[PDB]
């Protein structure tokens, strides 16, 4: 489920921004807990000076999904590790492909 290397747990939004800015590389990413909603996670990716945050969460059936723009088909994954792999590929709908994992 959520035993991935880039999962940092309960770190603050500002702490996440710091870790990513430190690498100085577009595409560096980490996963942390939402600062106020239980069961919701944030996939953070650095791109041109900003940290793009995508909200990730489970459904009743325990499948993971990233927040999608209105009109776009949602995509589900049983394991969060497969959601990450899917987004390491180009042209998948996010600002830039997940490339440099910032491990805990």
């Amino acid at each position: 489920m959520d035993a991935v290397a880039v999962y940092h747990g309960k770190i603050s939004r500002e702490t996440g921004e710091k870790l990513l800015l430190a690498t100085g590389l577009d595409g560096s990413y980490l996963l942390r807990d939402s600062e106020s909603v239980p069961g919701v996670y944030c996939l953070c990716v650095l791109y041109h000076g900003y940290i793009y945050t995508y909200r990730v969460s489970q459904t009743e059936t325990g499948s993971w999904s990233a927040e999608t723009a209105p009109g776009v088909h949602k995509r589900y994954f049983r394991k969060i590790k497969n959601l990450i792999s899917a987004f390491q590929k180009p042209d998948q709908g996010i600002v830039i492909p997940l490339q440099y994992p910032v491990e805990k």
């Binding site: 000076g49 900003y50 940290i51 995508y54 990233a66 999608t68």
Partner: peptide, 11 residues
């Protein structure tokens, strides 16, 4: 003040 931008998947 904040470098965080809340994004959504586009495809």
């Amino acid at each position: 003040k904040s470098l965080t931008i809340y994004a959504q998947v586009q495809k």
